Amino acid sequence: ARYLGPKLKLSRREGTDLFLKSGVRAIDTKCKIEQAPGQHGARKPRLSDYGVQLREKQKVRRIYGVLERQFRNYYKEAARLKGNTGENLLALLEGRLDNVVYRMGFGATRAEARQLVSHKAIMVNGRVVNIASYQVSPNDVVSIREKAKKQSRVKAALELAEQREKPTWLEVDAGKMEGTFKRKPERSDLSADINEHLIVELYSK
Amino acid sequence: VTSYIGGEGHNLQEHSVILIRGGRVKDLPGVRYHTVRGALDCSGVKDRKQARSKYGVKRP
Amino acid sequence: SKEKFERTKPHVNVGTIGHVDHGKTTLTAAITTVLAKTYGGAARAFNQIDNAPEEKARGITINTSHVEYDTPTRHYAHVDCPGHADYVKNMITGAAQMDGAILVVAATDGPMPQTREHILLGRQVGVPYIIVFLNKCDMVDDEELLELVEMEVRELLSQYDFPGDDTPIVRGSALKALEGDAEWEAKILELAGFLDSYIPEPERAIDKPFLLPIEDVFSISGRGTVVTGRVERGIIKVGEEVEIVGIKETQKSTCTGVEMFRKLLDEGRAGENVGVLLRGIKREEIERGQVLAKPGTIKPHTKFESEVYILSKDEGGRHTPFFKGYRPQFYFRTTDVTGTIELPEGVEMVMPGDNIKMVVTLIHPIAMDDGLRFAIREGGRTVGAGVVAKVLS
Amino acid sequence: NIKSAKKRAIQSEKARKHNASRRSMMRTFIKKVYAAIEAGDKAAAQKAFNEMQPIVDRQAAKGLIHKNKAARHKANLTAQINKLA
Amino acid sequence: MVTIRLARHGAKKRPFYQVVVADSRNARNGRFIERVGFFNPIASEKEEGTRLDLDRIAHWVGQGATISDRVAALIKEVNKAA
RNA sequence: GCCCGGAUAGCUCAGUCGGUAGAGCAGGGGAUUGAAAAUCCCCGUGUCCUUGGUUCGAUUCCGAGUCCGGGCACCA
RNA sequence: AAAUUGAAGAGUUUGAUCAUGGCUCAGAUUGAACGCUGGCGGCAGGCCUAACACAUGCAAGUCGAACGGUAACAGGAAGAAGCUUGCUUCUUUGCUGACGAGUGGCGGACGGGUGAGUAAUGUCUGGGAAACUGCCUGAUGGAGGGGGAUAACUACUGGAAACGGUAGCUAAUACCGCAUAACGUCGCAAGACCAAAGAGGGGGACCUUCGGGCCUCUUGCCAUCGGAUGUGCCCAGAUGGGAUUAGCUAGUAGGUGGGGUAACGGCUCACCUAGGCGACGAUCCCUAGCUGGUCUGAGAGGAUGACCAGCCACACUGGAACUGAGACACGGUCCAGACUCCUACGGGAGGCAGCAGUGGGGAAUAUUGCACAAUGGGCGCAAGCCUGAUGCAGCCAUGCCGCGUGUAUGAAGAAGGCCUUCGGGUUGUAAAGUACUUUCAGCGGGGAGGAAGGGAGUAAAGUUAAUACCUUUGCUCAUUGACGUUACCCGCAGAAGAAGCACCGGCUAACUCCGUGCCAGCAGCCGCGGUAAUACGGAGGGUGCAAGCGUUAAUCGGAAUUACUGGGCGUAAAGCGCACGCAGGCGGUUUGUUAAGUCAGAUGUGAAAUCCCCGGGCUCAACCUGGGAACUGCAUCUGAUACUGGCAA
Numbered sequence A: 001a002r003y004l005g006p007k008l009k010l011s012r013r014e015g016t017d018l019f020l021k022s023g024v025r026a027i028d029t030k031c032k033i034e035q036a037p038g039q040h041g042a043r044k045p046r047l048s049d050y051g052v053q054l055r056e057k058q059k060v061r062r063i064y065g066v067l068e069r070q071f072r073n074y075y076k077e078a079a080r081l082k083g084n085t086g087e088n089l090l091a092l093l094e095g096r097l098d099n100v101v102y103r104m105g106f107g108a109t110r111a112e113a114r115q116l117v118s119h120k121a122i123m124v125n126g127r128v129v130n131i132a133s134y135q136v137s138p139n140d141v142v143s144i145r146e147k148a149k150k151q152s153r154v155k156a157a158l159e160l161a162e163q164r165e166k167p168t169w170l171e172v173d174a175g176k177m178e179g180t181f182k183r184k185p186e187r188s189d190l191s192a193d194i195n196e197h198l199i200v201e202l203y204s205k
Numbered sequence B: 001v002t003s004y005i006g007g008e009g010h011n012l013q014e015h016s017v018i019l020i021r022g023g024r025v026k027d028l029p030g031v032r033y034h035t036v037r038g039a040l041d042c043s044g045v046k047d048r049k050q051a052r053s054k055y056g057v058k059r060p
Numbered sequence C: 001s002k003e004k005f006e007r008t009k010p011h012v013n014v015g016t017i018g019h020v021d022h023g024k025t026t027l028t029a030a031i032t033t034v035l036a037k038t039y040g041g042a043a044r045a046f047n048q049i050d051n052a053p054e055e056k057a058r059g060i061t062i063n064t065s066h067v068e069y070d071t072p073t074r075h076y077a078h079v080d081c082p083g084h085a086d087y088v089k090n091m092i093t094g095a096a097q098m099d100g101a102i103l104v105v106a107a108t109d110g111p112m113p114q115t116r117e118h119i120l121l122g123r124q125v126g127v128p129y130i131i132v133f134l135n136k137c138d139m140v141d142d143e144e145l146l147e148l149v150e151m152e153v154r155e156l157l158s159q160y161d162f163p164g165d166d167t168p169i170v171r172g173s174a175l176k177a178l179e180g181d182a183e184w185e186a187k188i189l190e191l192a193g194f195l196d197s198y199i200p201e202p203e204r205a206i207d208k209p210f211l212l213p214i215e216d217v218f219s220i221s222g223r224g225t226v227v228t229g230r231v232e233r234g235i236i237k238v239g240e241e242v243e244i245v246g247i248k249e250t251q252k253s254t255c256t257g258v259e260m261f262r263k264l265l266d267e268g269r270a271g272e273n274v275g276v277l278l279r280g281i282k283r284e285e286i287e288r289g290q291v292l293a294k295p296g297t298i299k300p301h302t303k304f305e306s307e308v309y310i311l312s313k314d315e316g317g318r319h320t321p322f323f324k325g326y327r328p329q330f331y332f333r334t335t336d337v338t339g340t341i342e343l344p345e346g347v348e349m350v351m352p353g354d355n356i357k358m359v360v361t362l363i364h365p366i367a368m369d370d371g372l373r374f375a376i377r378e379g380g381r382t383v384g385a386g387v388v389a390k391v392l393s
Numbered sequence D: 001n002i003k004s005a006k007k008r009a010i011q012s013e014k015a016r017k018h019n020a021s022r023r024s025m026m027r028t029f030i031k032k033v034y035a036a037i038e039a040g041d042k043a044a045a046q047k048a049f050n051e052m053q054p055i056v057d058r059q060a061a062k063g064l065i066h067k068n069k070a071a072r073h074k075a076n077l078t079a080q081i082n083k084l085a
Numbered sequence E: 001m002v003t004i005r006l007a008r009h010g011a012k013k014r015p016f017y018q019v020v021v022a023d024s025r026n027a028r029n030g031r032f033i034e035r036v037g038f039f040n041p042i043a044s045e046k047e048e049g050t051r052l053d054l055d056r057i058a059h060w061v062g063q064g065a066t067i068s069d070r071v072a073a074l075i076k077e078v079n080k081a082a
Numbered sequence F: 001g002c003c004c005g006g007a008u009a010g011c012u013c014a015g016u017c018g019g020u021a022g023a024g025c026a027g028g029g030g031a032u033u034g035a036a037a038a039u040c041c042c043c044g045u046g047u048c049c050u051u052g053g054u055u056c057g058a059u060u061c062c063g064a065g066u067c068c069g070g071g072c073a074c075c076a
Numbered sequence G: 001a002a003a004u005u006g007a008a009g010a011g012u013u014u015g016a017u018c019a020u021g022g023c024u025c026a027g028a029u030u031g032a033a034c035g036c037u038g039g040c041g042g043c044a045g046g047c048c049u050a051a052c053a054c055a056u057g058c059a060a061g062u063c064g065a066a067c068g069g070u071a072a073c074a075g076g077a078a079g080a081a082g083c084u085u086g087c088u089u090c091u092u093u094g095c096u097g098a099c100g101a102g103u104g105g106c107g108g109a110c111g112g113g114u115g116a117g118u119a120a121u122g123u124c125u126g127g128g129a130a131a132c133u134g135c136c137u138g139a140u141g142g143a144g145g146g147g148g149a150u151a152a153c154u155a156c157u158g159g160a161a162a163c164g165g166u167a168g169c170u171a172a173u174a175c176c177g178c179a180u181a182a183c184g185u186c187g188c189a190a191g192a193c194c195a196a197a198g199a200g201g202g203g204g205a206c207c208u209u210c211g212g213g214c215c216u217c218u219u220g221c222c223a224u225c226g227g228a229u230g231u232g233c234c235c236a237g238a239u240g241g242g243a244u245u246a247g248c249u250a251g252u253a254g255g256u257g258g259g260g261u262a263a264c265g266g267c268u269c270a271c272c273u274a275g276g277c278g279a280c281g282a283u284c285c286c287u288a289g290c291u292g293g294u295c296u297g298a299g300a301g302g303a304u305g306a307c308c309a310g311c312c313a314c315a316c317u318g319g320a321a322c323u324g325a326g327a328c329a330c331g332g333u334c335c336a337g338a339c340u341c342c343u344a345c346g347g348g349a350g351g352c353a354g355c356a357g358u359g360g361g362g363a364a365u366a367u368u369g370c371a372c373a374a375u376g377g378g379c380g381c382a383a384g385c386c387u388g389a390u391g392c393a394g395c396c397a398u399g400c401c402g403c404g405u406g407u408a409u410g411a412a413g414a415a416g417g418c419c420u421u422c423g424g425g426u427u428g429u430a431a432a433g434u435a436c437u438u439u440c441a442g443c444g445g446g447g448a449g450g451a452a453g454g455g456a457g458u459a460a461a462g463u464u465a466a467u468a469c470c471u472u473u474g475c476u477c478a479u480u481g482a483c484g485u486u487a488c489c490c491g492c493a494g495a496a497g498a499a500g501c502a503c504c505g506g507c508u509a510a511c512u513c514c515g516u517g518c519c520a521g522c523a524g525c526c527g528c529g530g531u532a533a534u535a536c537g538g539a540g541g542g543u544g545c546a547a548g549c550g551u552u553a554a555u556c557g558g559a560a561u562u563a564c565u566g567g568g569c570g571u572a573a574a575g576c577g578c579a580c581g582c583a584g585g586c587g588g589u590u591u592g593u594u595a596a597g598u599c600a601g602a603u604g605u606g607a608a609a610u611c612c613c614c615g616g617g618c619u620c621a622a623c624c625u626g627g628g629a630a631c632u633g634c635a636u637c638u639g640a641u642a643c644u645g646g647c648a649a
């Protein structure tokens, strides 16, 4: 159901920073990033055409915290939906509640946001929601319930979100822990690094 | 039918009721099945750790 | 399977013991017809005590047949044991569940070699009390000859370690009481009085969790597979989780009806022989020797340390030493099993009549705990009694 | 059998005792007409036809015979009387 | 005898009744002539709850069709002037 | 639940009525070759199904078992 | 406004090459099974094989408002006898309510189950006349006056039982005349002929002979012509494989006449004629329920027909009819048979391919549960009773889908393992440690929604002589849940209870070290192992999935490797040795002319579900669900004449 293993290990294998253990501190410099996936980390990989597709899929999975069965179902929805198949894959991933709760700044990590959603803290349109996979529709208002409001984990985690880029598609109040999801996220707004085309390639065959 | 007995060492002899799955060996010409290790009178392979669903062995 | 068994009067497990062709099974038949006529229980006959082809063409008994005769004070449950030297294995299962025996010595032949062997098995397994019955009487019309046999039985019991002189000896012909002789009918009504008076109310264990050793398995046409045996401890409710432990491996199950001599029950209490119906199990895969336990209470083991008391020539056992490798039969609750002996370091040989501990690796795993009693046997005779010390597996 | 609606067994057996007799009666009165036909002029045949006409109509109304059965036993039977005699 | 009755579809503990014009001898869910609206008892106060096409009811009840106990109540629920 | 047969070195078989078991076919050691096979020179390589007993001594005589073979029954 | 956005290749013959061509793999998918490992929930599913044989309970009854029963049973009323004169004994009373056993009504033919048979009697699509149709419902108008029976109950017997006989006796919506009948039934018409059943809730007035008659009103019967719904039959095309099955066929193919069928018909007879089918596959053989669909596919196709829905078929095996509106009748009947059965040996049973369950078969597939609360079904004015139909529950990771299994900080870069050029690296912020949660299980309190009704009353309406009774009703009452210690909500508590198992030589994401030495073993294809193995076994490390994972089997895909879209035949597999030629396929060219093909339009239909798109409802999803599109079709109807065909030059 979840990974629950060495999380910074996943970042070295992928190479880039996945925001798995982003947390309170800004930059890590405490793992020998890039040049140590495992024991044989100095080994320069040949890296085939199927490889680069798989590495790109596994990157987008590990960032958003999704498994292959659920991830492949997003592709099946993405193909049936209009527009571009690549742009839909990532738009549906960004619409998850655990991802929105992270992007609002109610969680230092996405796993912390996932636990916050799961443990009856998060609430949207006057209704409690436990599901990380909950597809947040356009024009919503996610928020924290008054029992778990201003607890020790959320106030420190919200100060981290000032250093972050902060999305344009959503807005945050910051005083009373109240969020507002407005429109669907655009391609050019977020990332500008993780390739969608290669993930569409992996599933089409 | 002839059936191949995978793993190192076995309890099969004379009679003993066993279970058969498909799969050629590609070496013994004529043998075109595999005995399932673990099922019925065919016991698991002794002292195995890696790949134990194949070869029918329980955890250590 | 229709009439509900009303829980009234204490339950007691009884059974006949004695030499071959000595009036052991005929006594069981005499007890039914006498008690059924006067008091007014269920009748039955000598027929079905032993039918089959095996117990007709020969005449001898192999299977441990059961009978249910009732009296004002208590509700008895008989276990007519076979008798022979070759049928000692299936006898010990009948003898283990039996609380208070009925020994059968004959006035003509007297105490014979099996009578010594049967009582020898009674002590080591678990037979608290015992009652004698002279089963010929009329054949030798004499006062001095019949009373000389009574002396030898009192000597036998006291020599082999029982009360002896305290045990109430009874005289009476079984065949004369089968028909309807007023003097001989009343003399076996007297035996029912001796059963109530001598044997006390048995001490049960209705608190510590459920266990039930399987004596014999059945397959009822319509309902499913059934297991019989005395409930050693605890209780059984209908629609409760039961784990079958012992030989082969371990299987999950649920009870779907407990019974007592073809009659229904709600709760199967401790210290009484009951037929438990099991859900979703075949006749072959469940076997004799396994135990019906409540899930998590007991675990099957194939290796254990155990304090064994070996017997000498005088007590009745081995008379020679033996080294590691020796393989005798170990009789736990019901079934027997073979196992290699690994002696402790600093013990070169095991002499007869000696107390020692030893590691024993069995071929089949049996359910056991620390503080379980067993009786070792080998070569058509006893070897030694003992107790379990530690678990290993 | 394992039902308390076996009244129908004894009811339907009681029915056909009655039902066969009235049917047997009808087909003999019809046989009476075919007996008259063959060697006979328009006199003996039409007397038998007038006798069976009420009997066949009546049994048609009671559900023993269907109304078309009755209709034919007039239709085809009149055609014997008219054509031959 | 044609009869207007409910069909009972939907999930476990979550019923949804397809009111339907069917023969009495045919099963509840089985054969029918034509479906004529629906009913949802677990709908609650929202946009949609119950619908019943009253034009087709005149074609059947007018000719000769019984109305079941529950469907007769929904013709009273939808009303003529309320 | 009880009757009966079956098991001998890696495989296929001889040998016994207490005198301590062998044959082929394998396998291994050295020589040779990258390693073999043949060629040449040397080796049974064994819990007599397991275990106890009668004895000076048991494959062999007598119990008790193992797993497997086939046979007859019992219906809480 | 939305209904398809859709087509990938790789390894493997050779020293190498290009081709040919097989083999294998990457993806979907399942009623699955097995091995290892297993936490929850939600919705689905769960004997494919022996249509094997099955103990036990249970799956269809129902009305007293049809009728005798003044009742088998339990209880009020006129009156009686004991004596504690209301406490007890007890005969009458349809009389207290009802109902064991009957008699009649309607049901049992529906609802469930299973695919044995069936290659056309069947199914599908579209048509079509020669038909019937209980219950429901339109209309018209009847329903009048009689009889003889007969169960139950006795009475008396026979029988072990199952089940009878003989003597009475009695009731009806049971039964049969009779009058009575038409736009009805036969006919050219004139004529003839054909039916009925009565019940129940209330009454002023007057007959009381008290059984009341007569008003009353719902109800029920009966005849016709009708709708509705069923059903029977007919035709056309379609609906598997084999020609190493080429001829089959005598009620066979048609006629006339008679019988029979609800209806037409060799349906069936008698005679008459000598046909009919057949190369556009008859006959025979093997296999098979069929469809909507399902899976797959870019699509064409290919495979399939578990679950939901329609049709058929069958009910221990082989027959027959009876009853009925409907059956040649799953839990009717009658024979016969095989197998179980009990007996008093005379004779009796019995039918799980209803629901549970057993043995057996098998790789393999579940509880002898609760409940009619809802939704239909059965009878009944109703109330209700009945219901293994349905709704719940159990079980099973068998699937699809959700949340779990914690979350920040954490350098001495600890120990231990593993590797090393012994400098160090790596496991690894992993852990421990400190900060925090508390989902889900574990607890304790709250607690919907599935419930519409049926009543008790009422109020006016209806209805009538009536301020009645039923028809409609709106107002007051107390109620109805198997699920149920419910959905969901709070209340603690502590990270506490909650992670495996494939793989790591190329295809194909991921590497070292020891052990072993063509041995032991691996293997989906190529191939690895002969003393320095990345492929074997273990260890560490990695990678991929994760309450699942792999292996096996099964279908399609890739396979343009049966090629219609879309392949070939000089040498790779493949031009008959070469001609003639009937059937068949194809046919130069210009006018006609039809309209078969073809094309256009239009109407009907292509069941619902499913698929697809935009919505909506379950905390989300799966799941359920509204509308739309679609259902690529088939039929008919009107046109168009270029082309193809027919037809005249």
Ligand SMILES: Nc1nc2c(ncn2[C@@H]2O[C@H](COP(=O)(O)OP(=O)(O)NP(=O)(O)O)[C@@H](O)[C@H]2O)c(=O)[nH]1
Binding pocket: C019, C020, C021, C022, C023, C024, C025, C026, C027, C059, C060, C061, C062, C082, C083, C084, C135, C136, C137, C139, C172, C173, C174, C175, C176
């Ligand atoms: N005359 C007489 N004979 C008796 C009496 N009791 C028993 N017997 C006889 O003893 C014989 C043994 O019968 P039974 O009791 O069945 O044998 P058992 O004692 O059960 N031993 P097993 O069953 O092992 O052979 C019978 O033949 C029986 O007639 C008795 O009181 N009098």
Ligand SMILES: [Mg+2]
Binding pocket: none
């Ligand atoms: Mg999951």
Ligand SMILES: [Mg+2]
Binding pocket: none
């Ligand atoms: Mg951590």
Ligand SMILES: [Mg+2]
Binding pocket: A204, A205
């Ligand atoms: Mg594709």
Ligand SMILES: [Mg+2]
Binding pocket: C021
């Ligand atoms: Mg003797």
Ligand SMILES: [Mg+2]
Binding pocket: C024, C025, C026, C060, C061, C081, C082, C083
């Ligand atoms: Mg005996």
Ligand SMILES: [Mg+2]
Binding pocket: C058, C059
């Ligand atoms: Mg004898």
Ligand SMILES: [Mg+2]
Binding pocket: C109
């Ligand atoms: Mg003697």
Ligand SMILES: [Mg+2]
Binding pocket: D001
């Ligand atoms: Mg009968």
Ligand SMILES: [Mg+2]
Binding pocket: D024, D028
């Ligand atoms: Mg006659």
Ligand SMILES: [Mg+2]
Binding pocket: D062, D063
């Ligand atoms: Mg009639």
Ligand SMILES: [Mg+2]
Binding pocket: none
């Ligand atoms: Mg039908």
Ligand SMILES: [Mg+2]
Binding pocket: E041
């Ligand atoms: Mg409602």
Ligand SMILES: [Mg+2]
Binding pocket: none
């Ligand atoms: Mg060598």
Ligand SMILES: [Mg+2]
Binding pocket: none
């Ligand atoms: Mg050699």
Ligand SMILES: [Mg+2]
Binding pocket: none
């Ligand atoms: Mg290709």
